[PDB]
Amino acid sequence: MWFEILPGLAIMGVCLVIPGVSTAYIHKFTNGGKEKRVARVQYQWYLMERDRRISGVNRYYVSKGLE
Amino acid sequence: PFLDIQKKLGISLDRHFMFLSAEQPYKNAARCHAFEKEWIECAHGIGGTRAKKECKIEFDDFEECLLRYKTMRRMHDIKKQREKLMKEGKYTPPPHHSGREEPR
Amino acid sequence: MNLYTVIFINILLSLTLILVAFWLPQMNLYSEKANPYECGFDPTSSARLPFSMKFFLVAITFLLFDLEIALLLPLPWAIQTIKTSTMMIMAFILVTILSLGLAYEWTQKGLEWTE
Amino acid sequence: AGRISAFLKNAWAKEPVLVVSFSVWGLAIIMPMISPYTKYASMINKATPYNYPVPVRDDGNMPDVPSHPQDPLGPSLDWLKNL
Amino acid sequence: MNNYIFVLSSLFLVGCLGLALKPSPIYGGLGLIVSGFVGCLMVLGFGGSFLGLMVFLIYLGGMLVVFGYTTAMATEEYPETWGSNWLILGFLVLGVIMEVFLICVLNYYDEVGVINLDGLGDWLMYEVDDVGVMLEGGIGVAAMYSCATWMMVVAGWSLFAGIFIIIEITR
Amino acid sequence: YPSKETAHWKPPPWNDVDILKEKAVTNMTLNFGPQHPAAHGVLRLVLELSGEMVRKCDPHIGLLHRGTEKLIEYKTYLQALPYFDRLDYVSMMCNEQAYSIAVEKLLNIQPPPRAQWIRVLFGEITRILNHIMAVTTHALDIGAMTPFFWMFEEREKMFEFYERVSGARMHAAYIRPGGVHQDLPLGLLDDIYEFSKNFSLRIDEVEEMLTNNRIWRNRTVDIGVVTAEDALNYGFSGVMLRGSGIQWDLRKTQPYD
Amino acid sequence: RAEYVVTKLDDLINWARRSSLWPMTFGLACCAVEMMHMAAPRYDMDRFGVVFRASPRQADVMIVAGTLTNKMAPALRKVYDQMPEPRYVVSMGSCANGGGYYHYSYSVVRGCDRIVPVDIYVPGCPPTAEALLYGILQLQRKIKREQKLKIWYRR
Amino acid sequence: RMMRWNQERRRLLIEDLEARIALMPLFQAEKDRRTLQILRENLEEEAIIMKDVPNWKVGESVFHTTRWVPPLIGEMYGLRTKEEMSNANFGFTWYT
Amino acid sequence: MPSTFFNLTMAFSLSLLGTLMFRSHLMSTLLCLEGMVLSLFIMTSVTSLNSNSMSSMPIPITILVFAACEAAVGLALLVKVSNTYGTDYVQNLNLLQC
Amino acid sequence: MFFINILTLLVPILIAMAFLTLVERKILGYMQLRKGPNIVGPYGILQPFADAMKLFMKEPMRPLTTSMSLFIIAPTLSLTLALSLWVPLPMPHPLINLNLGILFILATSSLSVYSILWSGWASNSKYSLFGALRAVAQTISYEVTMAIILLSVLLMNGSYSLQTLITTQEHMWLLLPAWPMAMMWFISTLAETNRAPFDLTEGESELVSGFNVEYAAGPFALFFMAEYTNIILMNALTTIIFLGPLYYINLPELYSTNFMMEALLLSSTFLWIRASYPRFRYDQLMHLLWKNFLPLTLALCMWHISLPIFTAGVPPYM
Numbered sequence A: 001m002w003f004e005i006l007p008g009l010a011i012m013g014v015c016l017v018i019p020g021v022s023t024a025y026i027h028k029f030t031n032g033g034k035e036k037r038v039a040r041v042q043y044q045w046y047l048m049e050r051d052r053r054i055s056g057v058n059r060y061y062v063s064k065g066l067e
Numbered sequence B: 001p002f003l004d005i006q007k008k009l010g011i012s013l014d015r016h017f018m019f020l021s022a023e024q025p026y027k028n029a030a031r032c033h034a035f036e037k038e039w040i041e042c043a044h045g046i047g048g049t050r051a052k053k054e055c056k057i058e059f060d061d062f063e064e065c066l067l068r069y070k071t072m073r074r075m076h077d078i079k080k081q082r083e084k085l086m087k088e089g090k091y092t093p094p095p096h097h098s099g100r101e102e103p104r
Numbered sequence C: 001m002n003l004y005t006v007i008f009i010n011i012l013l014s015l016t017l018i019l020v021a022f023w024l025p026q027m028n029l030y031s032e033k034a035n036p037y038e039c040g041f042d043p044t045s046s047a048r049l050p051f052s053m054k055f056f057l058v059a060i061t062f063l064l065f066d067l068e069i070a071l072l073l074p075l076p077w078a079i080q081t082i083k084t085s086t087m088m089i090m091a092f093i094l095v096t097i098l099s100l101g102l103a104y105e106w107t108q109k110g111l112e113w114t115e
Numbered sequence D: 001a002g003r004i005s006a007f008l009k010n011a012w013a014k015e016p017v018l019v020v021s022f023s024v025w026g027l028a029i030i031m032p033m034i035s036p037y038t039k040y041a042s043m044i045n046k047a048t049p050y051n052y053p054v055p056v057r058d059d060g061n062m063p064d065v066p067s068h069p070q071d072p073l074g075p076s077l078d079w080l081k082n083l
Numbered sequence E: 001m002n003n004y005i006f007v008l009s010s011l012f013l014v015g016c017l018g019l020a021l022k023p024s025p026i027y028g029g030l031g032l033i034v035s036g037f038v039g040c041l042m043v044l045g046f047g048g049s050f051l052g053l054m055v056f057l058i059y060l061g062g063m064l065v066v067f068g069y070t071t072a073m074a075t076e077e078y079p080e081t082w083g084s085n086w087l088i089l090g091f092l093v094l095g096v097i098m099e100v101f102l103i104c105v106l107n108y109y110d111e112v113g114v115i116n117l118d119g120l121g122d123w124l125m126y127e128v129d130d131v132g133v134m135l136e137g138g139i140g141v142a143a144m145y146s147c148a149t150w151m152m153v154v155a156g157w158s159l160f161a162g163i164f165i166i167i168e169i170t171r
Numbered sequence F: 001y002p003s004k005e006t007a008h009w010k011p012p013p014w015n016d017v018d019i020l021k022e023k024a025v026t027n028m029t030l031n032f033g034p035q036h037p038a039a040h041g042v043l044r045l046v047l048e049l050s051g052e053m054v055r056k057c058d059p060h061i062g063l064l065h066r067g068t069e070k071l072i073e074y075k076t077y078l079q080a081l082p083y084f085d086r087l088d089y090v091s092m093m094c095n096e097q098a099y100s101i102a103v104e105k106l107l108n109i110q111p112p113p114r115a116q117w118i119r120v121l122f123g124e125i126t127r128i129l130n131h132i133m134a135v136t137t138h139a140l141d142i143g144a145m146t147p148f149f150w151m152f153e154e155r156e157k158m159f160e161f162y163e164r165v166s167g168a169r170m171h172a173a174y175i176r177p178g179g180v181h182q183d184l185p186l187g188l189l190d191d192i193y194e195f196s197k198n199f200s201l202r203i204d205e206v207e208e209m210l211t212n213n214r215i216w217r218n219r220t221v222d223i224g225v226v227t228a229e230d231a232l233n234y235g236f237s238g239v240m241l242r243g244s245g246i247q248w249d250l251r252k253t254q255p256y257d
Numbered sequence G: 001r002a003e004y005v006v007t008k009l010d011d012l013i014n015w016a017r018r019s020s021l022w023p024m025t026f027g028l029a030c031c032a033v034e035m036m037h038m039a040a041p042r043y044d045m046d047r048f049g050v051v052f053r054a055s056p057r058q059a060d061v062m063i064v065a066g067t068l069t070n071k072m073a074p075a076l077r078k079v080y081d082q083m084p085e086p087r088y089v090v091s092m093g094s095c096a097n098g099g100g101y102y103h104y105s106y107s108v109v110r111g112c113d114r115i116v117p118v119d120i121y122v123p124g125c126p127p128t129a130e131a132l133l134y135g136i137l138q139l140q141r142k143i144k145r146e147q148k149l150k151i152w153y154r155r
Numbered sequence H: 001r002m003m004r005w006n007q008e009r010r011r012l013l014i015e016d017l018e019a020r021i022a023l024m025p026l027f028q029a030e031k032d033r034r035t036l037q038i039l040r041e042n043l044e045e046e047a048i049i050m051k052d053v054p055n056w057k058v059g060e061s062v063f064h065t066t067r068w069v070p071p072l073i074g075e076m077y078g079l080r081t082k083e084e085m086s087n088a089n090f091g092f093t094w095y096t
Numbered sequence I: 001m002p003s004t005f006f007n008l009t010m011a012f013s014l015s016l017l018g019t020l021m022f023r024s025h026l027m028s029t030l031l032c033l034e035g036m037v038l039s040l041f042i043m044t045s046v047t048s049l050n051s052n053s054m055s056s057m058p059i060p061i062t063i064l065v066f067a068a069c070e071a072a073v074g075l076a077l078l079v080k081v082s083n084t085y086g087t088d089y090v091q092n093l094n095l096l097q098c
Numbered sequence J: 001m002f003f004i005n006i007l008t009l010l011v012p013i014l015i016a017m018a019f020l021t022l023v024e025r026k027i028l029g030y031m032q033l034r035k036g037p038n039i040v041g042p043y044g045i046l047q048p049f050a051d052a053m054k055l056f057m058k059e060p061m062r063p064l065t066t067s068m069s070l071f072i073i074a075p076t077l078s079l080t081l082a083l084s085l086w087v088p089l090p091m092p093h094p095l096i097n098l099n100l101g102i103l104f105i106l107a108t109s110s111l112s113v114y115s116i117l118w119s120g121w122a123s124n125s126k127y128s129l130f131g132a133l134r135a136v137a138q139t140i141s142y143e144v145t146m147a148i149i150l151l152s153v154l155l156m157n158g159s160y161s162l163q164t165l166i167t168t169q170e171h172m173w174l175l176l177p178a179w180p181m182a183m184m185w186f187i188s189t190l191a192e193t194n195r196a197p198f199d200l201t202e203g204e205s206e207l208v209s210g211f212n213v214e215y216a217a218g219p220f221a222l223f224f225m226a227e228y229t230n231i232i233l234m235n236a237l238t239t240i241i242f243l244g245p246l247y248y249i250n251l252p253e254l255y256s257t258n259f260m261m262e263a264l265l266l267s268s269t270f271l272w273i274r275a276s277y278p279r280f281r282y283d284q285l286m287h288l289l290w291k292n293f294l295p296l297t298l299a300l301c302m303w304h305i306s307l308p309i310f311t312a313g314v315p316p317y318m
């Protein structure tokens, strides 16, 4: 009967969740538990390149505790 | 213009963005506002042939705010020297020009 | 740079997948399977003659509209102007003269496949 | 009428596309002219401070907003809220 | 990295060189879809992502017609394009050697600064905006509807009249 | 002021229109060879196209000639009966039913009634074996594939009304000049009833799918508008003339069985 | 070991060719009607990985149904000489095997085998759609038992 | 529901843009003193430790105007490494 | 910027050098006329994009609405060159000098 | 750690596409009352590997009359693009966010044509020149509408970034504001992605294996790998632009999980079509889409311009 289609779907259905859920966990691992922090404008790039300059060269960290 | 039916009507059909320092979209600036302004408020009511010899300081500058040429030979003569100076030495680049510094 | 890391790949994923298609089938190319098809016969003409299309006029009306489409695309930013009454009107004026230009051709038998 | 109003009836039965197009065309320009809220589009779009508001310097004049943002004078848009 | 745009620029000059040798209109059209793509890179290499994509939207639907008519008007029994003779392949290889010649000539005359292969890649943006917002292109192109609404009527009228100007040429 | 480089320049015309009658078109001779699925295995159909519109076609039917007007000459009237299944390989019994009458006429013989009835029964099951094969094959070429499959479960259900009657599913040499070779078995009409009560719905399950669309109704309509008096000049006589309004049929006019 | 690896590769190379073999939209006679009834919902080709593609370049087997006339014969070997050459052949019918009827006529070739070489022969005047299906299951093991990498190792 | 929601996205933008208004002073102050620290820190290289050449001024402008020229990437860190040169050139354009 | 415009000016010229030397096609000269436009799009955009002259950024589209409307009138004449000859060779139209 | 994201972005779409070849043969089957593949694997789960591994062993036809350079570049250019369109496609956070992330789609969507033109032009054959020409008047037909049906939706959104629509759809699907757009979008997702009830280009019954007939197995798969890979985009967009799943940012795998549930329907909705409707004869499709959709498009294009300014609904440029 028609239930023989579900393997073709639910194996296709464990195949388009990966590029969505892998795209975040791979970002958080690289970005320090945060999101990728996209930059559309020239201001959000300045905050990065500022925050890149308030730490080690990776920019997903230091804030208050300093002065 | 020939058959100037813009001043006759007053309206600015298209004579309000002929140059750089001309009503940018929201409030931006066109990278040489300070110089074109100083060039064209100079060359008003003196028009033409006498905007070409006495108002030459303002164009010689605006010709270098825009082309920005003499800053290249003044920044290529540096490299030509340092690239010559080093390679036979006599120059140790500091930390803040070879990488490692304390950013701010 | 991050995109060049995505897209030089896909050329290689295609280019590595094609070299393993010409150099791993064991071919036997001689004369009569290389020659063109036409459904079991030797083709009469040379396959590279004037086609003489019939939608020639519509291809141009597209050629004019791809500009006009391009000439619409800044509307998502134009609404973020302070006027929003010339953007109102001049967006009606562009879309209207188009339909007028489209309705004239629609009646004068432009998009009708000359035959 | 009949000789115009009943012509729309076949043009709504057959050709039921141009009637929508010719309607929505004529129904697009007409609605902003009879709206209560069209005034705000040039105002909600004029409130956005994309660029920085340059302050003037006090010279014994302009009893406007003093040197304090939360001061009741000035363009205090309470219309955007409570729209 | 520093040699980015000089590459995209010389691959454009070449995309417009073979375009000039006039092969069949297909391999000229191919020669423009490339150089149109390459134009989307340097326009984008200096900022605005809109304007580059535009060329790479017009001259796709542009050259899609150029593929159509050439199959109906402009095509031989044999295209005879690039790898077909030696009159084109000489002045396609001696154009490129002329390129590597010429640009390497006048870096020796580094006085007019037409190319500075040693001072290359360090003069491309010129002090843009670093702290800023609402600056990209497409804000400028959208001045068609505020403060430049004569670029708009004058180009719209061209397409209003092109649609009439074109059929009287066919009729 | 003529020069040697200009004595060949004849003067121009007055109306500024000259004469260039060329006829240099050649119209791209194409063929639907005998592999195109449109051609039912065998047809060539050489063209003269002007792009895609058809100016002149020239079918070269003959790629399946075998010569079964010359082999009947060397085989008796029973030994030639199954050739007639091959002519229309979709409507088999309707050919046997024809050849099994031209023979009977020459013999001045009539078959029994029960043969005439069953000879009519299968003559109008073949009517259903074929318009399935025409409604659906005319839809493969146009794109709709499913009613082909829906009915070839319904069509094989009728080959079992030959195999349960004759032996062969398709080429059943069953309708001979001597009436019919062999009677029905006890469990046959009781199954056509269980087949015929339901087939009328399967048309509705297809006739729905096609007789109300746009595509089917914008793809077949105004195609082949062959007029009335030209069909007869061409000699169609089957369905390509009653489809144009000529009331004509050889079962209301010339009922044979 | 090398032979055992090659026997399994050559058993694994054929699983693809024998499962997903794409026959060709042939025709020509009554016999082709049974192929449709083998595309029908009773004896499904597609269940066996068998698909009609109507071009030889996309094909993997020819099914010759029907009288192969002398006019059609060039168009039959012009077509067999357009596939790649893992190409297989199947001769449905007694008009295609020997020309059963029309063996003695003048416009009929006395066998598909006169012209194209053949891997298998399906008899029957209209062979039952469950009799090509026995053949294209038998052609589906006739090249399960081909050894094309084995006889490369020992060579 | 797109009336009442799209209004709020504006109301959030004003909230989000006025935040940016409060921090222009801190950034513009840092950016001034930063770029005003780059090109003194390029001058001292260019003053004694380099440039013992013939007639050559070290703080030498190329204008007659005396006003402030906003420096640029070709001058400002025009002689740092390439990666620091390829980070405003091609920094935001190449996707964060 | 002063390495591309010599390289784009030199790309304009080759296309100007191309649409003056023909090779037996009117439809490869019209074709060479669009890459001519294209180098002016880019050598206008950049000038309007390093100078940050956004007020001039409406211009690189207005240039280009007349790159296809000119090609449109250009393509449509080939329809009327073909329908006389059917070959589209530039050497075939010389009956005006008379 | 980026290559490990592409590796988990291209493997899980070439392995999905493969099982759309299967699912496009079973769902069509059970409608035809005929089981699809059941045998090579448990329920046909292992048929595309045969089909795939079958095609990379047969002789890639290098026909005698062709252009062997463009011959080889079109399938390189088809499988490249339609695979490369998944790059910005935002399951919540994309591999590559882009401001103009949808013009990237439109432009690269158009270069999927030149894989169909350069192929059939290179391959000397009448039945492939047509299929090339059959795309020319097809792209001419819908491409006017894949912009305006895509603009007027993104007109009551702001930037062209596909990421913004997740916030535009934070409380509602855009299917309800614009079902007229979504109708014509669906058909314009169906002309692009030439797989269709109106195929007209790979016409087995008219133009047998058009743009594709001189191509044998090796290059041949790169179109099926590209065509059935492109079927899932133009449904994946409808699951972003019109059907807005759940963001709720602490479980972002709820978006991707509902993104599944709708994309398979819209990928399984195309499958009812091919098994339900014939083609448009190639003169109707351009009389169906300049006459019926193009005016109706410009109207709603005009309505959504006077939709926010009438009310207030101005999208912000974040």
Ligand SMILES: CCCCCCCCCCCCCCCCCC(=O)OC[C@H](COP(=O)(O)OCCN)OC(=O)CCCCCCCCCCCCCCCCC
Pocket: A039, A040, A041, C001, C003, C004, C007, C008, C011, E040, E044, E049, E053, E056, H092, H093, H094, H095, H096, J073, J076, J077, J080, J081, J084, J097, J098, J099, J100, J104, J107, J108
């Ligand atoms: C077989 C033939 C194949 C050849 C054809 C291949 C076609 C590939 C597909 C075409 C690409 C479509 C056009 C892409 C334009 C860039 C899209 C864009 O606008 O965004 C670019 C993005 C910056 O833009 P944005 O994000 O909006 O700015 C704000 C910062 N976030 O970020 C960027 O700045 C990156 C921009 C550059 C990316 C261009 C990709 C080029 C890939 C190389 C192509 C050549 C192949 C290599 C040579 C191999 C030999 C064949």
Ligand code: SF4
Pocket: F086, F089, F171, G029, G030, G031, G065, G066, G067, G092, G093, G094, G095, G096, G100, G101, G124, G125, G126, G127
């Ligand atoms: S063998 Fe029988 S069924 Fe087959 S083609 Fe010949 S007559 Fe027809």
